[PDB]
Design an enzyme around this catalytic site. Sequence first.
Site, PDB file in Angstrom:
ATOM      1  N   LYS A 230     -15.123  -2.563  18.547  1.00 15.32           N
ATOM      2  CA  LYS A 230     -14.022  -2.665  17.379  1.00 15.32           C
ATOM      3  C   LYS A 230     -13.078  -1.432  17.316  1.00 15.32           C
ATOM      4  CE  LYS A 230     -15.518  -1.965  13.500  1.00 15.32           C
ATOM      5  NZ  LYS A 230     -14.593  -0.957  12.550  1.00 15.32           N
TER       6      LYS A 230
ATOM      7  N   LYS B 170     -14.668   4.228  20.835  1.00 12.64           N
ATOM      8  CA  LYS B 170     -14.635   4.128  22.134  1.00 12.64           C
ATOM      9  C   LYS B 170     -14.021   5.442  22.967  1.00 12.64           C
ATOM     10  CE  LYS B 170     -11.941   0.793  22.010  1.00 12.64           C
ATOM     11  NZ  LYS B 170     -12.307   0.658  20.426  1.00 12.64           N
TER      12      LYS B 170
ATOM     13  N   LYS C  84      -3.202   2.459  21.159  1.00  8.28           N
ATOM     14  CA  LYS C  84      -3.167   3.717  20.285  1.00  8.28           C
ATOM     15  C   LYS C  84      -3.180   4.809  21.280  1.00  8.28           C
ATOM     16  CE  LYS C  84      -5.940   5.695  16.637  1.00  8.28           C
ATOM     17  NZ  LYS C  84      -6.759   6.976  17.271  1.00  8.28           N
TER      18      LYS C  84
ATOM     19  N   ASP D 283     -10.719  -5.756  19.840  1.00  2.09           N
ATOM     20  CA  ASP D 283     -10.684  -6.504  18.608  1.00  2.09           C
ATOM     21  C   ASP D 283     -10.073  -7.970  18.957  1.00  2.09           C
ATOM     22  OD1 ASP D 283     -11.198  -4.073  16.557  1.00  2.09           O
ATOM     23  OD2 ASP D 283      -9.222  -3.624  17.723  1.00  2.09           O
TER      24      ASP D 283
HETATM   25  N1  LIG Z   1     -20.188  10.426  17.121  1.00  5.29           N
HETATM   26  C1  LIG Z   1     -19.033  10.881  16.404  1.00  5.29           C
HETATM   27  N2  LIG Z   1     -19.325  11.926  15.242  1.00  5.29           N
HETATM   28  C2  LIG Z   1     -18.178  12.377  14.757  1.00  5.29           C
HETATM   29  N3  LIG Z   1     -16.984  11.841  14.714  1.00  5.29           N
HETATM   30  C3  LIG Z   1     -16.755  10.947  15.628  1.00  5.29           C
HETATM   31  C4  LIG Z   1     -17.843  10.077  16.319  1.00  5.29           C
HETATM   32  N4  LIG Z   1     -17.603   9.030  16.930  1.00  5.29           N
HETATM   33  C5  LIG Z   1     -16.084   9.079  16.721  1.00  5.29           C
HETATM   34  N5  LIG Z   1     -15.665   9.865  15.695  1.00  5.29           N
HETATM   35  C6  LIG Z   1     -14.295  10.062  15.214  1.00  5.29           C
HETATM   36  O1  LIG Z   1     -14.277   8.681  14.964  1.00  5.29           O
HETATM   37  C7  LIG Z   1     -12.710   8.463  14.994  1.00  5.29           C
HETATM   38  C8  LIG Z   1     -12.480   7.289  15.654  1.00  5.29           C
HETATM   39  O2  LIG Z   1     -12.904   7.427  17.117  1.00  5.29           O
HETATM   40  P1  LIG Z   1     -12.267   6.884  18.477  1.00  5.29           P
HETATM   41  O3  LIG Z   1     -13.015   7.390  19.628  1.00  5.29           O
HETATM   42  O4  LIG Z   1     -10.668   7.136  18.207  1.00  5.29           O
HETATM   43  O5  LIG Z   1     -12.454   5.362  18.166  1.00  5.29           O
HETATM   44  P2  LIG Z   1     -11.748   4.325  19.111  1.00  5.29           P
HETATM   45  O6  LIG Z   1     -11.187   4.712  20.409  1.00  5.29           O
HETATM   46  O7  LIG Z   1     -12.742   3.131  19.217  1.00  5.29           O
HETATM   47  O8  LIG Z   1     -10.662   3.515  18.264  1.00  5.29           O
HETATM   48  C9  LIG Z   1     -12.216   9.895  15.249  1.00  5.29           C
HETATM   49  O9  LIG Z   1     -11.615  10.466  14.013  1.00  5.29           O
HETATM   50  C10 LIG Z   1     -13.144  10.485  15.788  1.00  5.29           C
HETATM   51  O10 LIG Z   1     -13.320  12.042  15.798  1.00  5.29           O
HETATM   52 MG   LIG Z   2      -9.494   4.788  21.353  1.00  2.00          MG
END
Ligand SMILES: Nc1ncnc2c1ncn2[C@@H]1O[C@H](COP(=O)(O)OP(=O)(O)O)[C@@H](O)[C@H]1O
Ligand SMILES: [Mg+2]
Lengths: 273, 271
Positions: free
Chosen positions: A9, A14, A41, A128
């Site tokens: 999601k 990711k 994104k 998603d």
């Molecule tokens: N294990 C973690 N501990 C702390 N912050 C995290 C962790 N995993 C993700 N984040 C935070 O969560 C948010 C979304 O993560 P992101 O990797 O961009 O998600 P996605 O790629 O799935 O959309 C960011 O603000 C990132 O810093």
């Molecule tokens: Mg991402």
Amino acid sequence: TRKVAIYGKGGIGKSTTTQNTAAALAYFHDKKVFIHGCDPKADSTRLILGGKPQETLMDMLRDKGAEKITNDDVIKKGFLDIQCVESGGPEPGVGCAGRGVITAIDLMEENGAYTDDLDFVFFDVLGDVVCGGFAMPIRDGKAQEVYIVASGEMMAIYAANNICKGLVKYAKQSGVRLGGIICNSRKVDGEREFLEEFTAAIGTKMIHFVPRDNIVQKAEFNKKTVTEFAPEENQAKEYGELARKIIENDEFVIPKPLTMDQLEDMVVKYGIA
Amino acid sequence: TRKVAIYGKGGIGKSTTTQNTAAALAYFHDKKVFIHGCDPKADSTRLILGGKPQETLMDMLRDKGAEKITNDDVIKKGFLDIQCVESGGPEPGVGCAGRGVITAIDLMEENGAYTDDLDFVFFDVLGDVVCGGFAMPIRDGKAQEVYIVASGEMMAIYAANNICKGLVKYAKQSGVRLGGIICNSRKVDGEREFLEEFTAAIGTKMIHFVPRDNIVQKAEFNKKTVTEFAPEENQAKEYGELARKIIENDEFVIPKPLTMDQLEDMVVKYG
Ligand SMILES: Nc1ncnc2c1ncn2[C@@H]1O[C@H](COP(=O)(O)OP(=O)(O)O)[C@@H](O)[C@H]1O
Ligand SMILES: [Mg+2]
Ligand SMILES: Nc1ncnc2c1ncn2[C@@H]1O[C@H](COP(=O)(O)OP(=O)(O)O)[C@@H](O)[C@H]1O
Ligand code: SF4
Ligand SMILES: [Mg+2]
């Protein structure tokens, strides 16, 4: 070369998981890693490339044009020469949000960008919806192995389950298999027990529990993955361990998706709110 | 009839907000409401109806066939005769996740389901991508007014901003306008200040602050909206107030979406 697709999601972790794992594979395990961003994104490579956002293949096709764009324009090298691509995609409202992923993967296959000396290609894929370019890595077998990032929340496991339905449909066509669920913790009680049960029920394993740790945001502020920023930190060691288990994984399954009723019953069983 | 599309990221509270607002419009404001689920999750109508999702139009087309389906098969009546439809969608991996939304809206237009005596039609639309059938309500002007559900969380505001780029694209063609952002609270400090700044910056308003309230899960356990379960509760009155502000809204804008850097800087400011 292991061709790995990371699904989940929006907001589940990711790109955090992919980039940190890629950095840990290069730093702790001496692996040659390529990251191909397949998420509109388009920040899937920002922390490997030390904060500079990379031009997307779609934006370059738009500005400079097809027969004037080289591998050097689309593939940038970051931390430990990890190679990075952003597919991009059309503006919200305009056409198929996944169309850039098709063009991007087609061009990388055309130009031999996925060289035989790579240990790992990671596709960081929006999960998603599982259609168009977002499905291509599974439908056309551009990735042979999938890991799904989830957490202790209904929508995270709903997305996981939906992605698993995609894998079931294309399992025989493409040879794609599920390698595991990565728990990217959202610091909720029952989370680990919930995902142990979820993974058993669909016929896989929770390959690793990644703790929620403030060091991720400290490293983001310094335009870095945790492994680059502070390789002695526990969180760097966690990605090194996830990296090890992916290298050594030999358990690849066709998953057994659950019904909506089974997902809802399993959420209330572990008191996930 | 006011044709309203509700957009937002998965899990943000689109279906909770739509169903409770629909129930509040019927109960507190004597309005005739139709809900058309345009989310493959297909539980957009469960709380208005008895419970456990209604059959989707796509699943019925799959099993009995078009030309053997009646209005009564696809449209169910729930709390205060609110009419409910689920578009459905193809299986994950099989074709475009939005294709059912187009089929479903086309069939409801064909069969005159959107009767002139309806005060409101709500489209509950998946907002994680804005393309195919998920864009159709904005691109083909099936809804004239949009509300976006968001919260303090980065991905909720990212989704809101991205949906606003969709609205900008189709603003002149379709006449679609943004009526406001609904903050469906995740009970975090800074949330209200974050959304006040975000909405001012993109040229809209936070039309309503919906508190996080346990009464929602108590009402879900009873297979009901909050207005049906306990209309004297403050949370029922909150949906009655959101309902009022939608009825009386006269502020419809083409938003001015933030750039990646502006959005990223504002997210880290209210972390
Ligand atoms: N294990 C973690 N501990 C702390 N912050 C995290 C962790 N995993 C993700 N984040 C935070 O969560 C948010 C979304 O993560 P992101 O990797 O961009 O998600 P996605 O790629 O799935 O959309 C960011 O603000 C990132 O810093
Ligand atoms: Mg991402
Ligand atoms: N205001 C609220 N207070 C408490 N719980 C809420 C509230 N809004 C939504 N929820 C809960 O959040 C979850 C997701 O909401 P839902 O309406 O399904 O989201 P979406 O339609 O955006 O996918 C549900 O379990 C619902 O009970
Ligand atoms: S195939 Fe998927 S990504 Fe493409 S238009 Fe349809 S919903 Fe959007
Ligand atoms: Mg919903």
